[PDB]
Amino acid sequence: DRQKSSFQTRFNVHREVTPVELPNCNLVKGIDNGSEDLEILPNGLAFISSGSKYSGKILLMDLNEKEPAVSELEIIGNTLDISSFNPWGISTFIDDDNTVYLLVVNHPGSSSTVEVFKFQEEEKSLLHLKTIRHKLLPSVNDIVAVGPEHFYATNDHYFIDPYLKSWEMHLGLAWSFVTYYSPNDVRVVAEGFDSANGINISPDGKYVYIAELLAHKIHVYEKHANWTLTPLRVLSFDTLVDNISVDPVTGDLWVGCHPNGMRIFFYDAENPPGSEVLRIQDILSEEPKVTVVYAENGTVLQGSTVAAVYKGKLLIGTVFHKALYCDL
């Protein structure tokens, strides 16, 4: 039927990547079970979620170092069950007092939560503050924090039940939605997505970017002062856009992508998924500039999900494999 060709475009079933090489890339020692999301503070500290599964941890890298090493951040507190910790998307928020909050999408079992931590820098540890859950956060993929416990969140499925959501994805229902959460108000701000994944915000707070993974699109929304979102632009791509990072200096989007959906969603060690990184400049203009900055067939890095730049270097994460650190 027609649902056979649509599945095949959605999952990019025969796409092969055109490699783009970077001359000094090195695998990050210590990252072998995923680096699904990451975020770099202005001071050069990078948080990385790992062990994402569908043992989990949050890693730290000081990118001001010449050969930065990963350390595992210890979770401090008695309000979180560490043994089920299964981190996915992350976000940070830095308050007036310079407190660094880390928000972490957690999937303990088949439920979704958002965990709030306070970064304790001197101790290199995470103080757990709060577990957030809500009817309108059924299947969280990523969030972008706009306060210590305020965020926009993507739900990449409508259903929670793993069997139902498997079906919803194969059918292409496109029922995934985006939710604004705050202590005072929780509501849906956009809906109808074919798997909303990455989400982020312009440095001036005026725009929100949402990755629609299986539609291969990035949506730009106007963010009003009352936290409402209104559609503004839709950019289309030939690749499965996953997590979005934002360079604070330029506002550029840096995007980790899966060139082929079959190889990322139906794993096969003899045919691993590759990696692909997009830079997007001037997203509001008539012709946004889209550059493939890095791409490979997975011989080195399999299943890139996220990429961000700090002072000439590019850090690339993956859903379940390694992480790559490159000169631009």
Which residues bind to Ca ion, rule: CB under 5 A?
A: 37, 89, 91, 142
Q: How far is the CB of 156 from Ca ion (least distance, A)?
A: 8
CA separation for the pair 29, 158 (Å, rounded): 37
Provide the CB-side half-sphere exposure for 244 (13 A, CA).
Answer: 32
CA separation for the pair 324, 180 (Å, rounded): 32
Q: List beta partners, residue 76.
A: 127
Which of 114/226 has CB closer to Ca ion? 114
Which of 147/327 has CB closer to Ca ion? 147
The DSSP code for 14 is T
- Give CA separation, 251 vs 159, 244, 281, in Å: 34, 12, 8
Q: How far is the CB of 38 from Ca ion (least distance, A)?
A: 8
- H/E stretch holding 87: strand 87-94
Which of 196/293 has CB closer to Ca ion? 196
Q: How far is the CB of 197 from Ca ion (least distance, A)?
A: 5
Which of 48/295 has CB closer to Ca ion? 48
CB atoms within 10 A of CB 8: 13
Residue with tokens 């915000």: 201
The token pair at 274 is 């590759």
Question: Cβ distance 10 to 172 under 8 Å?
Answer: yes
DSSP state string for 165-228:
HHHHHHHT---EEEEEE-SS-EEEEEEEESSEEEEEE-TTSSEEEEEETTTTEEEEEEE-TTS-
Which of 123/248 has CB closer to Ca ion? 248
Q: How far is the CB of 317 from Ca ion (least distance, A)?
A: 10
Which of 85/287 has CB closer to Ca ion? 85
Q: How far is the CB of 23 from Ca ion (least distance, A)?
A: 28
Start-to-end CA span in the chain (Å): 45
Q: How far is the CB of 259 from Ca ion (least distance, A)?
A: 15
Q: How far is the CB of 105 from Ca ion (least distance, A)?
A: 8
Which of 91/239 has CB closer to Ca ion? 91
